[PDB]
């Protein structure tokens, strides 16, 4: 449970997966393109 | 004679002498709407 599982596609362990699932982050990717912000104006995204 | 009015907050029907041009969209332009001037990109909106 504390080592990566070769069969599963994830590179982390089971417990690491649970830990990463227990914290919620809005900013994921660090890339926001101009076209996206222009095309999603009605959303009023905070990052935009 | 005392003239009183309001500016840049509501519809207006009294304007100074100025030639009106065509609408340019999806481009960075200087704009003047009823005396409010600025720079930016204009796009069709879903607001009502």
PDB file of C-alpha atoms in Angstrom:
ATOM      1  CA  UNK A   1       0.000   0.000   0.000  1.00  0.00           C
ATOM      2  CA  UNK A   2       2.948   2.391   0.486  1.00  0.00           C
ATOM      3  CA  UNK A   3       4.717   1.599  -2.805  1.00  0.00           C
ATOM      4  CA  UNK A   4       3.711   2.253  -6.424  1.00  0.00           C
ATOM      5  CA  UNK A   5       1.678  -0.501  -8.071  1.00  0.00           C
ATOM      6  CA  UNK A   6       3.055  -1.521 -11.499  1.00  0.00           C
ATOM      7  CA  UNK A   7      -0.317  -2.765 -12.771  1.00  0.00           C
ATOM      8  CA  UNK A   8      -2.209   0.471 -12.151  1.00  0.00           C
ATOM      9  CA  UNK A   9      -1.397   3.434 -14.431  1.00  0.00           C
ATOM     10  CA  UNK A  10      -0.798   5.862 -11.553  1.00  0.00           C
ATOM     11  CA  UNK A  11       2.812   6.529 -10.571  1.00  0.00           C
ATOM     12  CA  UNK A  12       1.921   6.983  -6.882  1.00  0.00           C
ATOM     13  CA  UNK A  13       0.966   4.643  -4.063  1.00  0.00           C
ATOM     14  CA  UNK A  14      -2.541   3.944  -2.785  1.00  0.00           C
ATOM     15  CA  UNK A  15      -2.101   6.095   0.323  1.00  0.00           C
ATOM     16  CA  UNK A  16      -0.542   8.886  -1.738  1.00  0.00           C
ATOM     17  CA  UNK A  17      -3.563   8.766  -4.048  1.00  0.00           C
ATOM     18  CA  UNK A  18      -5.913   9.107  -1.076  1.00  0.00           C
ATOM     19  CA  UNK A  19      -3.890  12.013   0.318  1.00  0.00           C
ATOM     20  CA  UNK A  20      -3.927  13.859  -3.003  1.00  0.00           C
ATOM     21  CA  UNK A  21      -7.674  13.236  -3.280  1.00  0.00           C
ATOM     22  CA  UNK A  22      -8.267  14.719   0.189  1.00  0.00           C
ATOM     23  CA  UNK A  23      -7.089  18.245  -0.790  1.00  0.00           C
ATOM     24  CA  UNK A  24      -8.964  20.386  -3.321  1.00  0.00           C
ATOM     25  CA  UNK A  25      -7.075  22.842  -5.541  1.00  0.00           C
ATOM     26  CA  UNK A  26      -8.727  25.215  -8.002  1.00  0.00           C
ATOM     27  CA  UNK A  27      -5.509  26.055  -9.878  1.00  0.00           C
ATOM     28  CA  UNK A  28      -4.414  22.927 -11.775  1.00  0.00           C
ATOM     29  CA  UNK A  29      -2.218  23.228 -14.857  1.00  0.00           C
ATOM     30  CA  UNK A  30      -0.648  26.697 -14.649  1.00  0.00           C
ATOM     31  CA  UNK A  31      -1.772  27.427 -18.232  1.00  0.00           C
ATOM     32  CA  UNK A  32      -4.747  29.640 -19.097  1.00  0.00           C
ATOM     33  CA  UNK A  33      -4.989  30.638 -22.750  1.00  0.00           C
ATOM     34  CA  UNK A  34      -6.407  33.939 -23.973  1.00  0.00           C
ATOM     35  CA  UNK A  35      -9.019  32.211 -26.118  1.00  0.00           C
ATOM     36  CA  UNK A  36     -10.285  30.271 -23.104  1.00  0.00           C
ATOM     37  CA  UNK A  37     -10.831  33.365 -20.964  1.00  0.00           C
ATOM     38  CA  UNK A  38     -12.468  35.194 -23.873  1.00  0.00           C
ATOM     39  CA  UNK A  39     -14.768  32.272 -24.688  1.00  0.00           C
ATOM     40  CA  UNK A  40     -15.807  31.675 -21.066  1.00  0.00           C
ATOM     41  CA  UNK A  41     -16.615  35.263 -20.095  1.00  0.00           C
ATOM     42  CA  UNK A  42     -20.024  34.381 -18.642  1.00  0.00           C
ATOM     43  CA  UNK A  43     -18.331  32.054 -16.135  1.00  0.00           C
ATOM     44  CA  UNK A  44     -16.519  34.901 -14.324  1.00  0.00           C
ATOM     45  CA  UNK A  45     -13.520  32.696 -13.563  1.00  0.00           C
ATOM     46  CA  UNK A  46     -11.352  33.945 -10.703  1.00  0.00           C
ATOM     47  CA  UNK A  47      -8.083  33.017 -12.420  1.00  0.00           C
ATOM     48  CA  UNK A  48      -9.082  34.927 -15.557  1.00  0.00           C
TER      49      UNK A  48
ATOM     50  CA  UNK B   1     -29.076  80.002 -17.735  1.00  0.00           C
ATOM     51  CA  UNK B   2     -27.982  76.985 -15.666  1.00  0.00           C
ATOM     52  CA  UNK B   3     -27.507  73.620 -17.393  1.00  0.00           C
ATOM     53  CA  UNK B   4     -27.527  70.398 -15.360  1.00  0.00           C
ATOM     54  CA  UNK B   5     -26.851  66.850 -16.555  1.00  0.00           C
ATOM     55  CA  UNK B   6     -25.288  63.492 -15.653  1.00  0.00           C
ATOM     56  CA  UNK B   7     -22.368  61.728 -17.326  1.00  0.00           C
ATOM     57  CA  UNK B   8     -21.389  58.164 -18.214  1.00  0.00           C
ATOM     58  CA  UNK B   9     -23.889  56.320 -16.016  1.00  0.00           C
ATOM     59  CA  UNK B  10     -27.094  55.895 -18.027  1.00  0.00           C
ATOM     60  CA  UNK B  11     -28.720  56.283 -21.464  1.00  0.00           C
ATOM     61  CA  UNK B  12     -28.214  59.630 -23.182  1.00  0.00           C
ATOM     62  CA  UNK B  13     -29.876  61.433 -26.085  1.00  0.00           C
ATOM     63  CA  UNK B  14     -27.869  64.696 -26.168  1.00  0.00           C
ATOM     64  CA  UNK B  15     -24.438  64.365 -27.765  1.00  0.00           C
ATOM     65  CA  UNK B  16     -21.692  66.528 -29.181  1.00  0.00           C
ATOM     66  CA  UNK B  17     -20.692  66.671 -32.836  1.00  0.00           C
ATOM     67  CA  UNK B  18     -18.776  63.508 -33.719  1.00  0.00           C
ATOM     68  CA  UNK B  19     -18.700  61.113 -36.658  1.00  0.00           C
ATOM     69  CA  UNK B  20     -19.762  57.561 -35.819  1.00  0.00           C
ATOM     70  CA  UNK B  21     -17.833  54.654 -37.352  1.00  0.00           C
ATOM     71  CA  UNK B  22     -18.452  50.959 -37.935  1.00  0.00           C
ATOM     72  CA  UNK B  23     -18.147  48.224 -35.313  1.00  0.00           C
ATOM     73  CA  UNK B  24     -14.933  46.172 -35.152  1.00  0.00           C
ATOM     74  CA  UNK B  25     -15.034  42.969 -33.103  1.00  0.00           C
ATOM     75  CA  UNK B  26     -12.480  40.370 -32.006  1.00  0.00           C
ATOM     76  CA  UNK B  27      -9.678  42.925 -32.263  1.00  0.00           C
ATOM     77  CA  UNK B  28      -7.782  45.305 -29.991  1.00  0.00           C
ATOM     78  CA  UNK B  29      -9.162  48.779 -30.738  1.00  0.00           C
ATOM     79  CA  UNK B  30      -9.759  52.179 -29.224  1.00  0.00           C
ATOM     80  CA  UNK B  31     -13.455  52.672 -28.509  1.00  0.00           C
ATOM     81  CA  UNK B  32     -15.756  55.538 -27.538  1.00  0.00           C
ATOM     82  CA  UNK B  33     -19.300  54.599 -26.480  1.00  0.00           C
ATOM     83  CA  UNK B  34     -21.483  57.632 -25.697  1.00  0.00           C
ATOM     84  CA  UNK B  35     -18.413  59.504 -24.483  1.00  0.00           C
ATOM     85  CA  UNK B  36     -16.834  56.674 -22.470  1.00  0.00           C
ATOM     86  CA  UNK B  37     -13.428  56.023 -24.035  1.00  0.00           C
ATOM     87  CA  UNK B  38     -11.054  53.116 -23.640  1.00  0.00           C
ATOM     88  CA  UNK B  39      -9.031  50.362 -25.272  1.00  0.00           C
ATOM     89  CA  UNK B  40      -9.939  46.708 -25.578  1.00  0.00           C
ATOM     90  CA  UNK B  41     -11.552  43.868 -27.499  1.00  0.00           C
ATOM     91  CA  UNK B  42     -15.305  43.776 -28.138  1.00  0.00           C
ATOM     92  CA  UNK B  43     -17.268  40.531 -28.390  1.00  0.00           C
ATOM     93  CA  UNK B  44     -20.960  39.609 -28.583  1.00  0.00           C
ATOM     94  CA  UNK B  45     -22.405  39.073 -25.114  1.00  0.00           C
ATOM     95  CA  UNK B  46     -25.096  36.848 -23.612  1.00  0.00           C
ATOM     96  CA  UNK B  47     -26.067  39.365 -20.924  1.00  0.00           C
ATOM     97  CA  UNK B  48     -29.532  40.939 -21.048  1.00  0.00           C
TER      98      UNK B  48
END
